[PDB]
Design a protein around this ligand. Structure first.
Ligand SMILES: [Zn+2]
Length: 281
């Protein structure tokens, strides 16, 4: 039971993010926090837009998402979402508080955004989107990205008149598995292209980042998307003499012809090949 031990072991993650209940076994994977049984239940009623609930012990976890949880966690997220509690003189619910008290708090905290600072801060500003963009880039600041997202930064922010890049494309150029995963968990469009028609998969291929290319493929990046030059990701991989991304893309296309006919997709596949390569990712 390595994942629950590992995620709990992050300082401050051994109590519920919302009521401090000890040894929480649930988590929100877009927020990056651990939660008790009661508060996880309340998170489900918010909607996937606000919170995606998973069990630390009962559900499977991809390694990169485990790493992401360890780079965020309760203390970091509460610095953002509970920033003004002390100055507002309000009472965070304790473990034995009622369901309704915790419902009220959680809703105030994550939906109403009652306890937020007015502007986001650089935790490692009038423009949350732009901050998100900048914090996603090399070197990425995950706490600052979370602060920007909390203050309404659009995950798919476009850097207008200025390449039209997105936080995801910026995280790709950073070769950051962690920032990409954070953005993807918070609704980034895996296929959104810059103004030259280059999506995240195009960028991962151009930059020779195998792991990122593999991640984008696993999240439904479109294999056949052509950029302004008419290049699809396979053309770029070939032109750049990159044997590993060639074979990923080529296997992705097979997996699709098997998903189209149905049904033989099963034991990714794309993963065991990504490991053998460790190529830029
Ligand atoms: Zn709780």
């Amino acid at each position: 039971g390595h994942v629950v031990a590992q995620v709990q072991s992050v300082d401050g993650n051994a109590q519920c993010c919302d009521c401090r209940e000890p040894a929480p076994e649930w988590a929100s994977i877009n927020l990056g926090v651990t939660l008790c049984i009661q508060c996880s239940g309340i998170h489900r009623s918010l909607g996937v837009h606000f919170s995606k609930v998973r069990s630390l012990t009962l559900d499977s976890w991809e390694p990169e998402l485990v790493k992401l949880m360890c780079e965020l966690g309760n203390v970091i997220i509460n610095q953002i979402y509970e920033a003004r509690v002390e100055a507002m003189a309000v009472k965070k619910p304790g473990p034995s508080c009622s369901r309704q008290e915790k419902e009220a708090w959680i809703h105030a905290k994550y939906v109403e955004k009652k306890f937020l600072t007015k502007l986001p801060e650089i935790r490692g500003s009038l423009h949350p989107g732009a901050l998100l963009f900048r914090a996603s880039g090399h070197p990425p600041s995950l706490p600052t990205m979370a602060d920007a997202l909390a203050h309404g930064a659009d995950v798919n922010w476009v850097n207008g008149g200025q390449d039209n890049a997105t936080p995801l494309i910026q995280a790709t150029a950073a070769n950051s598995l962690l920032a990409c995963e954070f953005l993807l968990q918070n609704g980034a469009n895996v296929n959104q292209a810059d103004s030259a028609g280059r999506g995240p998969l195009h960028h991962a291929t151009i930059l020779g980042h195998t792991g990122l290319a593999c991640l984008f493929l696993k999240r439904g990046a479109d294999l056949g998307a052509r950029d302004s030059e008419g290049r699809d990701p396979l053309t770029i991989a070939m032109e750049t003499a990159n044997a590993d991304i060639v074979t990923l893309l080529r296997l992705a296309k097979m997996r699709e012809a098997e998903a189209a006919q149905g049904q033989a997709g099963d034991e990714t596949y794309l993963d065991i090949f990504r490991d053998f390569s460790l190529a830029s990712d």
